[PDB]
Amino acid sequence: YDPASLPDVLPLYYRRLFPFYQYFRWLNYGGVVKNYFQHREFSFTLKDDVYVRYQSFNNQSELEKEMQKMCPYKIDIGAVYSHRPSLHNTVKSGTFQAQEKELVFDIDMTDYDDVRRCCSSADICPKCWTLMTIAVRILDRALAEDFGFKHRLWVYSGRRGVHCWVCDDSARKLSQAERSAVAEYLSVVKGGEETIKKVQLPETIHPFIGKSLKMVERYFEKYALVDQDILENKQCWDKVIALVPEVARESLLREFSKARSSVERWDKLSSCLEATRRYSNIPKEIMLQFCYPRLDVNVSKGLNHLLKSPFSVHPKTGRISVPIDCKKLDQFDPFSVPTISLICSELDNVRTRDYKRTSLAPYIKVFEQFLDKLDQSRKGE
Amino acid sequence: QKYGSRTNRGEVVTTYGELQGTTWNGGSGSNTNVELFTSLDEPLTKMYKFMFQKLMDIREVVSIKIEELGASLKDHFQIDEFTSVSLPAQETVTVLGQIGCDSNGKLNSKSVILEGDREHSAGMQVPVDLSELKDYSLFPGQVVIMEGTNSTGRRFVPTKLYEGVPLPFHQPSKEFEECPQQMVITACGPFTTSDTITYDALKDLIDIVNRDRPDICILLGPFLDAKHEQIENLQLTVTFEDVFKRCLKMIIEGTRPSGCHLVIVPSLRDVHHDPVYPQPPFSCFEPAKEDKERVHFVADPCTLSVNGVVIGMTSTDLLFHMGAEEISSSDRFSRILRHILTQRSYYPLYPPNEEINIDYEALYSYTPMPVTPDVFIVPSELRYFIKDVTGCICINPGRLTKGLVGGTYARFLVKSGAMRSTCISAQVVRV
Amino acid sequence: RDCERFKFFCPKCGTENIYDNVFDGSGLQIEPGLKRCSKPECDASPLDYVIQVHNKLLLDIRRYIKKYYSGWLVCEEKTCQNRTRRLPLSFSRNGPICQACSKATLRSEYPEKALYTQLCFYRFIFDWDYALEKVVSEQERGHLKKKLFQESENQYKKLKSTVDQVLSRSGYSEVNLSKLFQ
Amino acid sequence: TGDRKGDLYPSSLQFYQHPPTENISLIEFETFAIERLKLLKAVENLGVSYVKNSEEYSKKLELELRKLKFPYRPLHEEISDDVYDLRRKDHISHFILRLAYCQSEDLRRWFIQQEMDLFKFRFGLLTKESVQEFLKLNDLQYVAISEDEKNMHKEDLMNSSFGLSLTKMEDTEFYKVPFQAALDLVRPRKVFLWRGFAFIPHKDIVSIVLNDFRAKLSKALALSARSLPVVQSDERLQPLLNHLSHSYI
Ligand SMILES: [Zn+2]
Ligand SMILES: [Zn+2]
Ligand SMILES: [Zn+2]
């Protein structure tokens, strides 16, 4: 993909591929609340990194128009305000307030850098994507069981991670404090680059942590012991040794000198820890420190946060921010995600059904199913 | 002793109207309908909390009195503009205000001041020079409109004093066109001799009532006088309420044979009642079930409707109060009565006399005269009279007892739509 | 401290009795004020002439109400001290402007607070329960909380009922909680 | 219910939501105001001197409440006239003090603190039956999980509540609350969440009740400070309310 080719393709996509009808269905939420779509904030990033916010639109036609006119490189969705953002200058000071917004989570592979060995920075590979695969299951289950949020849209971020939009009416009316509470409840791996032991579970395992460890276990052997090989050599297993009390460290080292496979080393570590009881949760702390999602509480706490819009185009990879089907999560491949260049090649190879002829169709289908569920909830209620 | 041996019993001391026989008879309140005059303002029928007057409230009440009367007079006289009283005036200007005395004594022609209202004068006063006024009659608290000049800015010189404008009489409905003439016997306290507490004059009056069978009996206080020598020196062996209850029982039970509607008006001299004007009605007596429809405990002042005839009545000695303060250029009682009627208040004197306690909010709410009454009962220590003032029959029946000697009462006949001769005949008679 | 005390002339001896408290005396010698005359040679008990006490109380209440409604105003300036019954409509921010000097405010000679305090004092000098709780000591309270004083207690309650009735009709003794809390 | 009583005062504890509408005397006004000021000052002094859970605190507070004749204990007899009177006292006095303690933020905070303390104490003296009655009369609608559902989530509940023993847990009943109200509990993960509801044990319930109370009370004080000009014109009540905080008791 040639990023110099981005300015050539962006218009066509925004003209014949961007799913505006479903997009308006989403952000309009069945028209129940008046001025809901009209008070939504958008922000655009144009060529040469020119940023504009407090953009609002009257209806789908105005949005389609101004978007096709601007051809933005980035589209971010923001809060629904007390008035129309376009007229925020006209609103008396203090009377312009963000009132409702989806509850959103951003999981970014870059935040896992201190604990992955295959890639670094913005590089991803099939060996590390399983971490995202774990996160979506660990988090989404909580959101479906502990909090009872029923309408959850998971979206690929385009490069390094995934976003989650929780769109239940209750989740859209949550205050800042309630959002911060939700984020802290879901958050376990606490600390920066200056801390080595980032998980310190108490004697009692809270049911949520038990279910997160249960989800982790299913994948741990493949991710950590086979793929990541977190015990390949001394430079790496020294870390895991650094994560357990010194008392057994020596006892482990000799054992790790006689083990040929990291699965064997994990068995040995588990046996040694079991023999050594307050430390019976130490293996769980290691698993969490290598597998549990990291959440930027600043992303989810603030109501006025602008997050990458679904079906955006990644300025560098060119991939489309496509929704991820929860059931088919295990089959999701971030490298097969349609790029803008591929879908423009597909478009120029054959009115409201043009996208069905591209590789974008199944993802718009997943989005349509999610919107159908939202409509059913709006009606039934 | 002196009262019991009197020789002028039944003498007619004053007469007015159509001559009637030596004996008067009534309908015993058969075809009689007595109520309170239904005007825009609600009547005073229950006690109101008093003893708490803010000077600001008094100011507002007085100012609105002046303003309202001046507005009515301005509409009537087609006056263009009122001018501030205090400002100098080299040419003739029309000024609205109220009269007063520059000192605490009694008003005289050299002590007259005019105080304006808040709307046109910011409440400012000005001395008045009555040298250029040929004819006038002024009392304190009188709302007046005058044409005059103020050349020095310090002394107003009136040249014209606008006359008063009485309210229109009542236009009775035809509902009472077929009702007969009604007989009213009115008496005012004190009801007992100065040296007795037995109510002998009241017994004589009750006998007269049962004999003549009037349609209405209007009894004005005091019923237990505060100035009674026995009351002041604390020689009474029973509580004031008990004496008053005995008196009211005597009145009500003794009038049972006559079947006469009794209208009881309190007086500021009633030692047992709340000392405040306008006085609320008596509320310490519950008439038996057979007298509930006959007894009317009304307020002071009262405007009563009797088969369409409007009777104004007040226990307060208005004539004595205003005679001590009215100044005239050259009948004095007729002038005072016309002043009362034209000011459209049952107590237009300000400041009041020393013997009356005035709650000014209640005064504002319950002293406006709704219309000009057909009959106006004004008992006074002055001599009894029956006068015709601007078509209103003003009756002073005196007081039933004058010290140690018996007094007088009045009897009159009222019919709605007669001939304006709503008062067929009236007589001040001796007890 | 600025309220007039209750003066009652004994019907028998004619000596003035000043009442300023429910109880007179100290210790076991303490008895209600209206039990014995102030003159040692006089054996008359004012509690016998309670009708007269009631009448005098009503007359005094009338006197104080008349004093209040007289509406006497005095200039606050020492060098003016103008005394008038007439309230002028010309007001400054502080109240009526004295028309003698035109530079000082007219103050009521007998304000509403004075009358309210006088009525409250007349209630106080007949408040048996309040005197027992606050004014009276412990041994004195014990001596007064027995029989031999029940009749005096009943008469004092009746006499306090009069002042309570009068105060119930005063706009300065009722608080309308509806107007405060809305 | 002798002469002029009613169902206006069902329970001892109340949130003080509805202002009084009666016409009281100035003497009653002053007596109630001063008495509740004494009660609140006693609460503050005992809170400073002793630990609020201490038995000395409870004994001294009960003594003060008895001395000033305020409602502090329930009575499973009926609404006796005397009891009614006491409750009326409490209800009027509270609002009077509101008028006294809304002029300045400092004052407001002080008032709120004392009131909360008193309320907590009174709740601590409520029998379970009475407690439920209260929770119903104010539409708090705390149940309360069934026994069957409790057995259904037995292990989750056991691992949720810190320091809860198996049998002791069997002896306890939880409540279902929307998670938006248990922020302080959920945030450190000390209460189980299932389908948007937290399962909160009982000692703790007073906390939630108090939270609600505090919210309401703060709002009320704001409104009172907004309605101050109407009261300053009443000279009779100005010396008291403007200076109650500095009144010798
Ligand atoms: Zn990788
Ligand atoms: Zn004596
Ligand atoms: Zn002066």
UniProtKB/Swiss-Prot annotation, chain C:
The motif CysB motif: which residues? 75-101
As a miscellaneous remark, the entry gives: In eukaryotes there are five DNA polymerases: alpha, beta, gamma, delta, and epsilon which are responsible for different reactions of DNA synthesis.
| Compartments, as annotated in UniProt | Nucleus
Where on the tree of life does the source sit, at the highest rank? Eukaryota
Relative to the complete UniProt sequence, the shown stretch is: 1271 to 1452 of 1458
Q: Which family would the database say this protein is a member of?
A: Belongs to the DNA polymerase type-B family.
Q: What is the lineage of its organism?
A: Eukaryota, Metazoa, Chordata, Craniata, Vertebrata
Q: Subunit comment for this entry? A: The DNA polymerase alpha complex is composed of four subunits: the catalytic subunit POLA1, the regulatory subunit POLA2, and the small and the large primase subunits PRIM1 and PRIM2 respectively. Interacts with PARP1; this interaction functions as part of the control of replication fork progression. Interacts with MCM10 and WDHD1; these interactions recruit the polymerase alpha complex to the pre-replicative complex bound to DNA. Interacts with RPA1; this interaction stabilizes the replicative complex and reduces the misincorporation rate of DNA polymerase alpha by acting as a fidelity clamp.
Q: What is this protein called?
A: DNA polymerase alpha catalytic subunit
Write out the residues that bind Zn(2+) 2: C75, C80, C98, C101
Q: What does this protein do?
A: Plays an essential role in the initiation of DNA replication. During the S phase of the cell cycle, the DNA polymerase alpha complex (composed of a catalytic subunit POLA1/p180, a regulatory subunit POLA2/p70 and two primase subunits PRIM1/p49 and PRIM2/p58) is recruited to DNA at the replicative forks via direct interactions with MCM10 and WDHD1. The primase subunit of the polymerase alpha complex initiates DNA synthesis by oligomerising short RNA primers on both leading and lagging strands.
CysA-type zinc finger locations on the chain? 10-40
